[PDB]
Amino acid sequence: PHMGALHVVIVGGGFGGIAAASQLQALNVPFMLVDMKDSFHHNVAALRASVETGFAKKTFISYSVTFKDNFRQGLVVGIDLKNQMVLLQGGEALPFSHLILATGSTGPFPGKFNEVSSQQAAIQAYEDMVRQVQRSRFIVVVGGGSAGVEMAAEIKTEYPEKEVTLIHSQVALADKELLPSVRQEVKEILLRKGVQLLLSERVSNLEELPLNEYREYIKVQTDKGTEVATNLVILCTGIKINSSAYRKAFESRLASSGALRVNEHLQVEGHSNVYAIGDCADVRTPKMAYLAGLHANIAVANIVNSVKQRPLQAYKPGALTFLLSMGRNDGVGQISGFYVGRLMVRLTKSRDLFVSTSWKTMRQSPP
Ligand SMILES: Cc1cc2c(nc3c(=O)[nH]c(=O)nc-3n2C[C@H](O)[C@H](O)[C@H](O)COP(=O)(O)OP(=O)(O)OC[C@H]2O[C@@H](n3cnc4c(N)ncnc43)[C@H](O)[C@@H]2O)c(O)c1C
């Protein structure tokens, strides 16, 4: 029983969650941010952190330094809707008047890092990854979605002398939703960088492969009988909505995606005090970090606007913005539905990978 008082709980400390937490902190609204890690992960830069020595420490930002007693590390195992509690592993419970679900996506390392561990262990996992890439003359990237084409491009840009093969199950690279001109340019850039492309092939012995580790010899097989000898296998095979925290409680209002259905105010269907932001919300746009932060502004604003009996802010998508960095010197993509070239993408994304915007949000300075 909050007896009218606000206490917001944010489940997930990603791009959406740290934006929500930062705004709630500036409004002096009581809240608790929950994340399984001890630091925010700027995962847009996770592939650069897999190939550049010393870079990983720029991609993890301590929660407690920024949020102090408004942060609690923990693993959310469920949501008790009748008694308005967030259920943590270990048995602890967090009461809320409003709930913001910002649980993001899960997938293979290095592109995603969803482990309970300390900031130094997380940084070391990416430094270890860099050392496996450095030891490995021959490298296979599996999956030619937008992550795989970035992974392969990063390796060949930092290490032109390595042999890199990208194996992709479709005939075209990167998102089906992209302008065809963008998808063709991605292909032409990988080929000009010397990446060997095996298109329309599915790697078929994934269970038998050592992953993210150098070996003197690894044989990759595909369903068409192609065999590739390599020293290192990196998986960029896709991601899944991380419905872990809320799956049982909200099974009624889940999309196929695993996301939560929401109106244009980002309240979860059937609720007025539960919001979903970022990857876990069921919007028609693609899963983007910058959209996560914009949903965060909308959700917090609507919590306040609901208390002030004011009209709620509305989320209105426009045409697709999607930028692919192709190593630090190259890239291609589209901004609001039209093509942008390699100089533009290099300057906007490939050089810094938006890293400074997260340190600014967290009001910390990178080491
Ligand atoms: C992999 C990748 C992604 C890119 C890339 N580029 C861009 C880009 O240029 N622009 C962009 O907007 N998005 C880009 N993205 C997408 C961006 O990474 C994601 O869209 C973004 O992370 C989504 O932000 P969310 O806030 O929705 O989710 P996160 O995954 O960031 O965070 C969720 C958090 O919840 C925590 N969590 C989840 N379930 C939990 C539970 N049960 N208990 C506790 N904590 C939990 C997780 O540990 C994690 O900390 C990119 O180059 C790469 C290589």
Ligand SMILES: NC(=O)c1ccc[n+]([C@@H]2O[C@H](COP(=O)([O-])OP(=O)(O)OC[C@H]3O[C@@H](n4cnc5c(N)ncnc54)[C@H](O)[C@@H]3O)[C@@H](O)[C@H]2O)c1
């Ligand atoms: N630059 C950006 O904006 C950016 C970059 C990365 C990711 N993202 C976001 O994350 C989402 C996921 O992207 P992603 O690339 O991680 O996944 P994805 O699902 O877009 O691509 C993974 C691909 O790997 C293929 N694959 C799976 N197993 C395979 C196998 N054994 N052999 C060969 N191919 C195999 C899949 O069929 C799929 O085409 C994007 O749709 C977007 O929302 C954005």
